[PDB]
Amino acid sequence: KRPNFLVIVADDLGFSDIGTFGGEIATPNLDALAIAGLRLTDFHTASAASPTRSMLLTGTDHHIAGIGTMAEALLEGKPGYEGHLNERVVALPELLREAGYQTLMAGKWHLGLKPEQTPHARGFERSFALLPGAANHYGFEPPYDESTPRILKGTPALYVEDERYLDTLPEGFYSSDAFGDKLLQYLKERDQSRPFFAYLPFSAPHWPLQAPREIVEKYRGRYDAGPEALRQERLARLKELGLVEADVEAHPVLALTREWEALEDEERAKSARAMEVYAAMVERMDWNIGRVVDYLRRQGELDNTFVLFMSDNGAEGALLEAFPKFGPDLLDFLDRHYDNSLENIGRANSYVWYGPRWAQAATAPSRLYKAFTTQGGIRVPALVRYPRLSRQGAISHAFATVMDVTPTLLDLAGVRHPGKRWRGREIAEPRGRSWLGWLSGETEAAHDENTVTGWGLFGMRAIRQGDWKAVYLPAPVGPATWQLYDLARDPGEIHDLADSQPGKLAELIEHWKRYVSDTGVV
Numbered sequence: 120k121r122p123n124f125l126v127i128v129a130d131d132l133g134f135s136d137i138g139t140f141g142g143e144i145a146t147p148n149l150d151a152l153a154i155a156g157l158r159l160t161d162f163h164t165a166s167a168a169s170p171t172r173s174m175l176l177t178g179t180d181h182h183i184a185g186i187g188t189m190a191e192a193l194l195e196g197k198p199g200y201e202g203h204l205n206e207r208v209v210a211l212p213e214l215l216r217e218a219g220y221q222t223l224m225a226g227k228w229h230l231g232l233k234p235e236q237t238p239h240a241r242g243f244e245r246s247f248a249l250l251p252g253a254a255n256h257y258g259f260e261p262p263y264d265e266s267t268p269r270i271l272k273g274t275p276a277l278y279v280e281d282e283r284y285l286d287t288l289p290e291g292f293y294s295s296d297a298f299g300d301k302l303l304q305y306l307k308e309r310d311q312s313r314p315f316f317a318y319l320p321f322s323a324p325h326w327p328l329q330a331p332r333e334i335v336e337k338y339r340g341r342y343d344a345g346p347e348a349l350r351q352e353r354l355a356r357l358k359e360l361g362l363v364e365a366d367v368e369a370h371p372v373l374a375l376t377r378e379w380e381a382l383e384d385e386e387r388a389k390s391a392r393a394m395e396v397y398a399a400m401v402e403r404m405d406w407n408i409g410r411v412v413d414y415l416r417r418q419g420e421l422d423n424t425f426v427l428f429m430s431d432n433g434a435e436g437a438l439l440e441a442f443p444k445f446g447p448d449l450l451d452f453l454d455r456h457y458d459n460s461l462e463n464i465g466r467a468n469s470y471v472w473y474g475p476r477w478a479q480a481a482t483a484p485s486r487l488y489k490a491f492t493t494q495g496g497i498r499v500p501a502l503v504r505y506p507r508l509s510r511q512g513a514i515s516h517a518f519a520t521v522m523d524v525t526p527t528l529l530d531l532a533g534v535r536h537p538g539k540r541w542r543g544r545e546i547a548e549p550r551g552r553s554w555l556g557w558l559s560g561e562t563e564a565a566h567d568e569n570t571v572t573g574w575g576l577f578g579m580r581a582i583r584q585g586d587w588k589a590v591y592l593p594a595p596v597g598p599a600t601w602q603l604y605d606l607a608r609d610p611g612e613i614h615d616l617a618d619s620q621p622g623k624l625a626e627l628i629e630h631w632k633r634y635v636s637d638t639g640v641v
């Protein structure tokens with residue numbers, strides 16, 4: 120008996136959004152996986168979507184795997200800054216597929232748009248994928264020409280099924296529902312006598328925030344108290360459930376938007392409606408996850424499926440109107456082409472994001488959010504449900520990263536990572552470490568006080584060894600200097616220890632430099 124795998128990835132979901140992670144959002148199917156499984160509180164991704172994906176599916180750092188910076192932000196020709204998963208890496212599905220696994224995917228790819236970079240070309244026997252980093256959840260497209268804001272030009276509903284670039288979408292297309300139908304179709308059509316690797320990367324709860332009315336309607340008024348009232352509920356509940364320490368000091372909320380109590384009644388009603396919509400996206404995703412899990416359960420296969428759920432990065436605090444490289448004139452265009460009046464928020468012809476204060480409610484007590492290298496952007500909820508593993512039913516604070524997944528699943532599938540050559544081309548070997556020892560109860564963790572780990576994206580840096588972490592946030596968002604935090608004592612990265620622990624910081628700076636050098640950071 121070799122296990123199946125089901126790897127589920129939410130897009131921009133916050134740490135505490137889910138019930139079992141302290142949330143008020145209805146997430147029954149995940150909750151059952153979570154409570155019975157092992158919930159991780161110190162599992163890390165990268166600070167953004169394609170870099171994290173490239174890590175998930177290779178076992179090594181994104182600067183090596185081809186996604187040194189996002190394809191949207193370019194460096195060109197430099198090795199590892201291709202904008203797609205490149206040929207210096209072998210992908211997890213490619214390895215499993217050669218060792219007998221049915222490799223199935225329905226979801227967001229974000230690892231390349233060209234025929235030779237598709238899920239189909241990178242190891243997926245069957246795939247229904249959105250290739251870009253985002254799109255209108257309903258397939259409603261604005262006009263595409265030179266004047267179209269760059270962020271919208273970058274996010275058409277460009278879907279593929281295997282080799283076929285789809286020329287249209289079914290009527291009633293809603294992303295999370297379509298990903299559910301398709302993964303379910305592929306499972307129903309599988310060879311029932313061989314195991315599967317099912318990849319279910321949703322695009323929910325990623326902007327634009329959109330969900331079926333009948334689900335949003337369930338959260339009517341739930342968010343009228345605003346994002347700071349929400350953060351306080353989330354923090355109380357995280358403490359209550361044992362996910363963060365009872366005495367944790369939460370990092371302060373930093374936002375340049377007007378605070379909730381400064382907003383006029385209409386502004387509040389609309390931002391509350393966006394968080395209602397967001398909630399509805401999470402529940403609806405959860406509901407599609409339940410369709411898949413329930414089918415597997417009825418087939419007598421769930422207990423022999425290793426189930427991993429994770430978000431791909433921290434909650435999305437961005438103001439898309441603030442980076443002019445997303446424009447020109449994003450708001451003016453949206454004003455001319457979309458209907459963001461209150462009643463319409465959440466339909467196909469709205470386009471909203473919920474902004475820095477709602478995001479920060481879900482990353483608390485961590486500092487900031489997506490696209491930053493602080494714990495807010497990189498510490499994400501994750502759970503592992505596999506009953507043959509001995510650590511199950513508990514909360515774990517042991518360090519782990521997204522790069523650990525590939526070695527774990529290869530391990531469990533009984534497949535050796537090929538080493539430094541594959542198909543004759545020279546390739547990278549995983550920087551992650553298999554969780555098998557730790558999850559089978561042999562060891563306390565998969566990493567230790569000497570484990571060194573690096574991040575670097577959008578000019579921001581982090582370097583971590585054991586539980587010490589240094590951070591570099593450039594201007595205008597940080598001091599453009601190295602700050603040092605003891606994450607065991609200060610998980611909010613509030614208390615800069617550069618002055619009191621300068622030796623330790625210089626050690627980390629040295630490790631940072633090895634990292635820059637070993638991964639090809641520019």
Ligand SMILES: O=P(O)(O)c1ccccc1
Nearest residue numbers: 167168169191252253273
């Ligand atoms: O927020 P994401 O990094 O996943 C993204 C997607 C499409 C365009 C730009 C950024």
Ligand SMILES: O=P(O)(O)c1ccccc1
Nearest residue numbers: 389459460470471472473
């Ligand atoms: O900040 P958002 O673009 O999502 C917005 C919401 C209501 C009216 C205008 C813009």
Ligand SMILES: [Ca+2]
Nearest residue numbers: 130131168431
């Ligand atoms: Ca993401």
